[PDB]
Amino acid sequence: TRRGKIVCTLGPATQRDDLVRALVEAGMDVARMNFSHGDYDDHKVAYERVRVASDATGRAVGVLADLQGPKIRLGRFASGATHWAEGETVRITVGACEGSHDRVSTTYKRLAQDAVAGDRVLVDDGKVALVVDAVEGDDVVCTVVEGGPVSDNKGISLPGMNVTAPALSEKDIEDLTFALNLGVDMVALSFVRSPADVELVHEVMDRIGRRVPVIAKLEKPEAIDNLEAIVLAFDAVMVARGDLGVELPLEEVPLVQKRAIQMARENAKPVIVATQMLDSMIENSRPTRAEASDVANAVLDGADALMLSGETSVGKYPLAAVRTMSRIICAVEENSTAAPPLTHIPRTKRGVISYAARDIGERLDAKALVAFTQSGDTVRRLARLHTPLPLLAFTAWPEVRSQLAMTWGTETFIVPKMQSTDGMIRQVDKSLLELARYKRGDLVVIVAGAPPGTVGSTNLIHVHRIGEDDV
Amino acid sequence: TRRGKIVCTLGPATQRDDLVRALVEAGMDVARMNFSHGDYDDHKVAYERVRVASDATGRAVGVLADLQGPKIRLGRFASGATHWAEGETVRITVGACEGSHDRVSTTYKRLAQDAVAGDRVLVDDGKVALVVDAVEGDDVVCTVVEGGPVSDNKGISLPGMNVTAPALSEKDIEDLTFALNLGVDMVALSFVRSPADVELVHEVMDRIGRRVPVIAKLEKPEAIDNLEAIVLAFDAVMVARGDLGVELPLEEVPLVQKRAIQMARENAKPVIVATQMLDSMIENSRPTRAEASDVANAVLDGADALMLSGETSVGKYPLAAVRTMSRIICAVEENSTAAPPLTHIPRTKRGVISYAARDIGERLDAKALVAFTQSGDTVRRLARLHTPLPLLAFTAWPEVRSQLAMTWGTETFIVPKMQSTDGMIRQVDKSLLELARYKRGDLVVIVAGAPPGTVGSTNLIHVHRIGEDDV
Amino acid sequence: TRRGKIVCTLGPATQRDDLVRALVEAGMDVARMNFSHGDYDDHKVAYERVRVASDATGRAVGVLADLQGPKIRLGRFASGATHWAEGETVRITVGACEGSHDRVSTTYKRLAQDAVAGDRVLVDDGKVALVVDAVEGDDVVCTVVEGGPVSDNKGISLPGMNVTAPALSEKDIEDLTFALNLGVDMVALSFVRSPADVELVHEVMDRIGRRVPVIAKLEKPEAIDNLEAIVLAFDAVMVARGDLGVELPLEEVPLVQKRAIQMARENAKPVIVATQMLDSMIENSRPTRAEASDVANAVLDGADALMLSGETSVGKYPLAAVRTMSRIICAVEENSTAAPPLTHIPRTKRGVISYAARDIGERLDAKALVAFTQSGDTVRRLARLHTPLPLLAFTAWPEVRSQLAMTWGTETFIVPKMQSTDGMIRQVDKSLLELARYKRGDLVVIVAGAPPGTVGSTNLIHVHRIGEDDV
Amino acid sequence: TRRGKIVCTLGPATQRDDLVRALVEAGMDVARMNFSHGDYDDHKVAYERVRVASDATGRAVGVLADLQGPKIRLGRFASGATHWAEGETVRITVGACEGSHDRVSTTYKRLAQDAVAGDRVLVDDGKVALVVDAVEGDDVVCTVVEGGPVSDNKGISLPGMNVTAPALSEKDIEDLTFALNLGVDMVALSFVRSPADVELVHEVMDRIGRRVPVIAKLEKPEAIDNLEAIVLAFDAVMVARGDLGVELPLEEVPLVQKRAIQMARENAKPVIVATQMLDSMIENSRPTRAEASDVANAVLDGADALMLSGETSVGKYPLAAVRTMSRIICAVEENSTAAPPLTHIPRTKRGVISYAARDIGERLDAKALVAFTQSGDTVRRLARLHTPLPLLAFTAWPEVRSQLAMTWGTETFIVPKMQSTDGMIRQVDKSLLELARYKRGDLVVIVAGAPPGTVGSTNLIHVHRIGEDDV
Numbered sequence A, B, C, D: 001t002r003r004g005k006i007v008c009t010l011g012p013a014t015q016r017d018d019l020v021r022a023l024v025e026a027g028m029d030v031a032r033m034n035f036s037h038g039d040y041d042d043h044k045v046a047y048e049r050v051r052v053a054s055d056a057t058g059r060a061v062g063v064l065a066d067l068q069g070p071k072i073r074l075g076r077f078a079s080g081a082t083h084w085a086e087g088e089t090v091r092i093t094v095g096a097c098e099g100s101h102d103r104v105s106t107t108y109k110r111l112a113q114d115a116v117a118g119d120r121v122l123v124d125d126g127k128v129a130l131v132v133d134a135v136e137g138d139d140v141v142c143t144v145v146e147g148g149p150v151s152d153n154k155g156i157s158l159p160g161m162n163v164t165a166p167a168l169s170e171k172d173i174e175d176l177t178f179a180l181n182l183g184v185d186m187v188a189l190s191f192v193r194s195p196a197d198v199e200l201v202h203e204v205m206d207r208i209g210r211r212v213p214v215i216a217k218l219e220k221p222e223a224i225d226n227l228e229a230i231v232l233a234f235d236a237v238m239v240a241r242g243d244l245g246v247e248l249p250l251e252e253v254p255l256v257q258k259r260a261i262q263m264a265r266e267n268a269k270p271v272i273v274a275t276q277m278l279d280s281m282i283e284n285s286r287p288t289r290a291e292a293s294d295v296a297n298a299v300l301d302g303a304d305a306l307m308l309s310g311e312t313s314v315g316k317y318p319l320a321a322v323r324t325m326s327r328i329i330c331a332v333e334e335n336s337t338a339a340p341p342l343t344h345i346p347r348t349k350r351g352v353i354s355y356a357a358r359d360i361g362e363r364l365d366a367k368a369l370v371a372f373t374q375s376g377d378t379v380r381r382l383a384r385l386h387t388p389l390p391l392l393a394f395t396a397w398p399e400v401r402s403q404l405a406m407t408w409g410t411e412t413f414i415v416p417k418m419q420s421t422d423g424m425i426r427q428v429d430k431s432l433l434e435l436a437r438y439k440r441g442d443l444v445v446i447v448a449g450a451p452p453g454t455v456g457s458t459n460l461i462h463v464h465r466i467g468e469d470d471v
């Protein structure tokens, strides 16, 4: 089966009966909850449908809370919507108002103070484009250079302009709280610019007495300028291509993507590639050739996971989008699971041992590679390498199974907390023998460690035949 | 400035005044003429607009005549158009009729004879999908499984069906004739399945007493089965992804693409990657992130040329599409012009010599690599390798400059037919000195051959300082 | 201290009291007992002085019994020694006689029968060369073409003439018996021509109910023609350059040597390079520059062991010879322990596991690599790879320690037969902690296997800190 | 046939009739003239016999004048030779004496002034070793610690003790003058310690108005400490292993040798490996297995040339020594001519062009590589790479043919100074076609340059069929 993992975003198109279920059945590995949209009741109901379907199918399904971050927006228009046509003069004010066609508010209150004649304003990820002509007191006077519909609270971007704003807004703090309490497995922060941003997220987590892995969304120049530091301070990264391709020139994105994936894999952190991978499937039952290409190349780049946004959240073919993404990933992997080699020899015990384990399993035509992990790390150091062999993570911490739902190639098995390595290995035999797929005599390579139940204690590789007396 | 070449398709959106001119000024290297649409007067007028703009700007612009081939189609409906909704029963007959919703003709007369219950019919390249239920004499009874509008003479595709049909129809023969006489520099044949197909194209060329390079369009499984033989019998190949992605499962296309490009480069034949690279720019001023990726990755794959179809032929942003494709290609090449290495060491004299010439130029920080060529071959054996240095082809055959407009990284200079290599070299100095770019003292590496004016006599490499007495 | 092993041959110059002891103290790893020379009493006495010195110093010292095989020889001269000068006529007879300058016996009784005028006779490995002029009844009449001293029972070689003679003579069978019962650790067979030769040696071993590893000496073309098969049927090989350099053109020996060493290492069998490595030290206190080169280059070739013959057996500087060979080996290893890479990736479980163990140890700056071995194999699969880390074999079978005395870079530790791997590892800690070299906290990488005490069960690698509770 | 070059030293054993001739006929490429020994009349006579035999056979033979340098020596004994046995007390005096067993003069007059108890004195390159016990006035009182024969004017070495002595003595200056005027092609300087030493040799050359290439003999640690700078300031280097193996521990010589050869080849300077390569052939008709190895491994190291010293100069088998060295070199090359790759990509025009020329010739199965050279450089940059193809240097300077006698794999052809490259190529065809061996139609690859007759102008490669009109 498929190795590369699939992240799906939930929304109106996944709300009806049995749709969340059918997505899990079709292969969804992580469900994204977008806190830019919806009320807490919608998110509750959806969280529940994921848990049910996960538990009922037996498939792991992580739940990802995506926080809006310091997204700058327009306010409200008197009609709810207007049309901004090429050639029109429009004012965007930091003063309060119900907007109209001619004059509308924004949420960023430093706009008149930070925007200068010449600056470009892109709306809703680039559809509508303005150029700033002047700042008159509170108003930024602009000319529509590319026309289109604008509506209430649509997002805007000021490329190159330096935005001042806290990494977490008060809204994000409340959403993070709601999300932690409700049980989500991972958290994504929009618009990260600094490694220190993760500290503020942890500050909230600790007040509430609950940490989960934090994903840095990459969609700002500052973030790419600090890519290594952010990859190291955060637990995963998402190449967030939508905003990234307006905050940076869109022509720079393909290579940023590839550098971000390599850097994640060098440091054994998960990476998700997001946004418009199958955009046209919002309206159509089959994607474009660009889209099919984009997906396959994301796999070849070495992405742990690929994401669907409006394709599943608001589109007309949520299911077909997931199956389609899965067919493409599988076509590529059947040919080869190879990923770009690492540019360093492993130095950490867990890295070196997981790298050796891979060598061993492949060179002996082993039936699976198995690694025990308490925090996920030992598995992530193997996953990053890619291998055509099954990679089965074993753990006694349930949440790690959900967290590893976004790690390449990896199936997770929950087992009791064992106090010996012999016991870890008996647990492997038991879990595997319940599967039609494995039988006595099957050769596997097991990575484990003592002291048991200690993160990072990983220190042994054992070649084992299932059921046989060789331990 | 850009190395990878851009092919644009002409149609209604480029008929408007001085649009062809603006495309050449924006970077168009080859103009595609699609004989599936338009009358001979349209194609004449457009050919002329290209010649004018080429000659007036000083930019080379090849003209590519694209022949429809044995394209299967529906006939005509009494209303001109209908809606085929999921659930409905439709008959496709090999008998003649003015169609209706329920019953419409097809041009493939073996359809009732070659279709079995269960076969799939994709219409309009997949915006309508039917399954064959039964054959009653002349009629193929189907059920619409995916619904949409159909109109007069829309194309259909019957995946996996073994189609019997001549490589050239009588229409293609008359179009090929019209095109050869009108002066086109290259010819593309749709739906190639065999290396023998090129023989029929040559048969017409020879009757008319005019040969040009023949591009095999790859959009059939039979073509991929025979990829090597077709690459070797034809002068170029085009990865024709639109039809390829219905004739093959769409998920298989990305890897076919990459192996087709490799195979072209191994044998020093041009390759064009075509179709939906920037599809959404038909409606929008900026492409999707999948589209930007698809373009960048076409460059990294090693493609000589990338193509725009409806993006320039019928869309709202023909210019912006070209500029946008050019910005993306340039972003990638600035990082590196590196292409996947060849999987053999060059054996032919011209290959070995062009490979050495590159070694020399790069190792000595030469300003340019310069190669004399009568048919283009010597230059194509260098182009395929990629290099960050300018690659300047020199020739005395005008048509070769146009033919090399689709070869990677290559600019061509026409000069008189010389009777010595010393003379070839004097001509280099003279042509180059008229350029703001070059100056006396500039070191360049020149490939040439004696006997002069004989294809494949290439046998000399000279490291030369422009204007200096070192020959 | 030194990794490459040193084999010394015992004889008259090592018979004095505690010279055997001083050789062990100077570095001797294997003592060669040459059954071409000496009484059973001499070999007994010397075997015992080796056991004593080994047990008294604590250093491992293998004892290698070298069987003469089908060696052709001269008989006795009335003076004991003579000079055969260029130009002289000499008779070598198969009749028994008082030998003199003019006429001397030989042991090969088919000589007069199988010699043709023109056959060449090389004496004492080529210090004297004769050509056969005629056969008169029992005498082969020759002319000295290259002159030199000859003595009693010196060997002869008849190149090209294919000799008829059993692989083991009746004398070799009795010597093999005497040697097995006396306790020797290894057996060498001179003049091997076939892989089936090892079966005859085993036939004797099995009659007597005691096997030891059999070294094939390579000094016939038939042996080089069958190198791979012999390396696989025998347990070790010796490049026996003395006879090899007359049976083959001497100019072909250096490359045969190198191929034979590579072949041994590919199949994890020990290889010794023998004869004239420091020949001049028979008479002189310091070797030639050729000799010092020949030793260094034997190390770089990848030899497990280098041997001294007359340098220790009959010469004036047995001790200095050993120290000198050791200084040279050490100078080379201090630079690098690199050996030519193997031309295949490991496939046997023990090969794959030992190769991984090396990777792990080096990458984690381990203090040693430790491997449990019952037959030696697991350790030989690591030794062959070379590594700058100590390679410590653990075993419960004493004779294995002596057998591994000829395996590169390897020290052995005897410990009790354990019934678990935990127990094997406790034994590592205990053995090592007694030593100045190791202390608690020291990182080591241990290879072991279950089921315990089973040859080839090797199946685990454990990264262990000495004395700490991580098992 | 043989690529590696063979240097022979002339002396008493080559004064015998027609011996110089027979050496040239057997393969000698360079004749070494050792100014440590002989009258100017002997060196004249021998120079002449080399010129004659070179001109009579048609074979190139360089003449190398070897300057004694600051060599410290014993004086004369009143038998001409004595035996210094372990345990004896010996005096070495800086004063005048009747020289005997007990007391002998030395040439180094600072010896009593520079010697401390404990200093070691090695004689005749180490075949007698003494330790200094005291200095009494003019005498250095010693104890023979390693015994052996000593004779008149044997050299001595004082390791660690820093000797004061001019790089060129008065004698060397006169010998250098005599040698330049007599016509020698190259000069070797003994005991080089500094790159500035070559300046002093040039200073003499320039006074006399004639330069030849200077070989730095490497036999002091100071020279190895400065290896790169010396290889760059001098035109060639000789690994002078005799003195180097007493001035350094002999165990360190083999690795110095290999590093010195690599360093020579990186900078396109010739390297000779000298001394005791086949030492035993002084007395014996066949060498040891160490010796045969030492020669083979010198070839594999990448030595341009190997040298014989006493093997030809004073020994009993000068001819057989040369033939034997040639057999061994050929045996190795028949297997492969490969040399250790260079650790840099070529940057100099001539390096890059010669490296390309090699690529081209081998990839096209050319019959030869031909390079024009005025100073030899262009040919040395190719030779260093090794190739199995004939490498034929062309030049208009006769002395260059003799100089290139010690460059690997290289045969030279003298031709007129030409005014064009077309002309250089006509001359190739003419010179080659006079040979039975070459024939019209043969493909060859020629390296040449304009402006003509200018060192370093090398700037073209031409692939040429002999006799055909392709230029």
Ligand SMILES: Nc1ncnc2c1ncn2[C@@H]1O[C@H](COP(=O)(O)O)[C@@H](O)[C@H]1O
Pocket (backbone or CB within 6 Å): A350, A372, A373, A374, A375, A376, A377, A378, A379, A394, A395, A396, A415, A416, A417, A418, A419, A424, A448, A449, A450, A451, A452, A453, A454, A455, A456, A457, A458, A459
């Ligand atoms: N099911 C389990 N029972 C006990 N310990 C475990 C279990 N799974 C993992 N561990 C421990 O967690 C370590 C791996 O944690 P980590 O290095 O963070 O991946 C292993 O070496 C084990 O000691």
Ligand SMILES: Nc1ncnc2c1ncn2[C@@H]1O[C@H](COP(=O)(O)O)[C@@H](O)[C@H]1O
Pocket (backbone or CB within 6 Å): C350, C372, C373, C374, C375, C376, C377, C378, C379, C394, C395, C396, C415, C416, C417, C418, C419, C424, C448, C449, C450, C451, C452, C453, C454, C455, C456, C457, C458, C459
């Ligand atoms: N002291 C010991 N006690 C029990 N088994 C041992 C001991 N030493 C080596 N072995 C066994 O020998 C196997 C490796 O031997 P070999 O296949 O010859 O390398 C290991 O897997 C162990 O099971």
Ligand SMILES: Nc1ncnc2c1ncn2[C@@H]1O[C@H](COP(=O)(O)O)[C@@H](O)[C@H]1O
Pocket (backbone or CB within 6 Å): D350, D372, D373, D374, D375, D376, D377, D378, D379, D394, D395, D396, D415, D416, D417, D418, D419, D424, D448, D449, D450, D451, D452, D453, D454, D455, D456, D457, D458, D459
């Ligand atoms: N026969 C010749 N006539 C004229 N020039 C020559 C001849 N042989 C060699 N040369 C010159 O020697 C140069 C190579 O010199 P070098 O850089 O020292 O190898 C070439 O570029 C030639 O121009």
Ligand SMILES: O=P(O)(O)OC[C@H]1O[C@H](O)[C@H](O)[C@@H](O)[C@@H]1O
Pocket (backbone or CB within 6 Å): A232, A266, A267, A268, A269, A345, A346, A347, A348, A350, A351, A352, A381
């Ligand atoms: O040496 P490796 O196993 O490849 O680990 C590479 C890097 O990644 C990890 O995430 C650690 O945070 C780093 O300290 C480490 O240097």
Ligand SMILES: O=P(O)(O)OC[C@H]1O[C@H](O)[C@H](O)[C@@H](O)[C@@H]1O
Pocket (backbone or CB within 6 Å): B232, B266, B267, B268, B269, B345, B346, B347, B348, B349, B350, B351, B352, B381
């Ligand atoms: O050796 P090369 O110059 O790279 O040529 C490789 C191949 O390319 C050419 O296109 C020819 O079709 C082949 O006959 C040739 O073998």
Ligand SMILES: O=P(O)(O)OC[C@H]1O[C@H](O)[C@H](O)[C@@H](O)[C@@H]1O
Pocket (backbone or CB within 6 Å): C232, C266, C267, C268, C269, C345, C346, C347, C348, C349, C350, C351, C352, C381
């Ligand atoms: O290097 P390996 O994969 O462990 O193979 C080692 C080879 O030599 C061993 O000594 C065995 O005799 C062979 O069965 C084996 O193929």
Ligand SMILES: O=P(O)(O)OC[C@H]1O[C@H](O)[C@H](O)[C@@H](O)[C@@H]1O
Pocket (backbone or CB within 6 Å): D232, D266, D267, D268, D345, D346, D347, D348, D349, D350, D351, D352, D381
């Ligand atoms: O780059 P190459 O052609 O190999 O030259 C390598 C070296 O050789 C010469 O001896 C030059 O003096 C160096 O400056 C040069 O870098």
Ligand SMILES: O=C([O-])C(=O)[O-]
Pocket (backbone or CB within 6 Å): A190, A217, A219, A239, A240, A241, A242, A243, A244, A274, A275, A309
């Ligand atoms: O946040 C995102 O997904 C984006 O901006 O593409």
Ligand SMILES: O=C([O-])C(=O)[O-]
Pocket (backbone or CB within 6 Å): B190, B217, B219, B239, B240, B241, B242, B243, B244, B274, B275
């Ligand atoms: O013909 C084409 O270009 C296609 O179908 O993609």
Ligand SMILES: O=C([O-])C(=O)[O-]
Pocket (backbone or CB within 6 Å): C190, C217, C219, C240, C241, C242, C243, C244, C274, C275, C309
């Ligand atoms: O047997 C030997 O030792 C030899 O031939 O050198």
Ligand SMILES: O=C([O-])C(=O)[O-]
Pocket (backbone or CB within 6 Å): D190, D217, D219, D239, D240, D241, D242, D243, D244, D274, D275
């Ligand atoms: O000068 C030499 O040749 C030496 O010392 O070896």
Ligand SMILES: [K+]
Pocket (backbone or CB within 6 Å): B034, B035, B036, B066, B067, B068, B069, B190
């Ligand atoms: K067409």
Ligand SMILES: [Mg+2]
Pocket (backbone or CB within 6 Å): A190, A219, A240, A242, A243
């Ligand atoms: Mg975003």
Ligand SMILES: [Mg+2]
Pocket (backbone or CB within 6 Å): B190, B219, B240, B242, B243
């Ligand atoms: Mg098509």
Ligand SMILES: [Mg+2]
Pocket (backbone or CB within 6 Å): C190, C219, C240, C242, C243, C244
């Ligand atoms: Mg022997």
Ligand SMILES: [Mg+2]
Pocket (backbone or CB within 6 Å): D190, D219, D240, D242, D243, D244
């Ligand atoms: Mg010397």
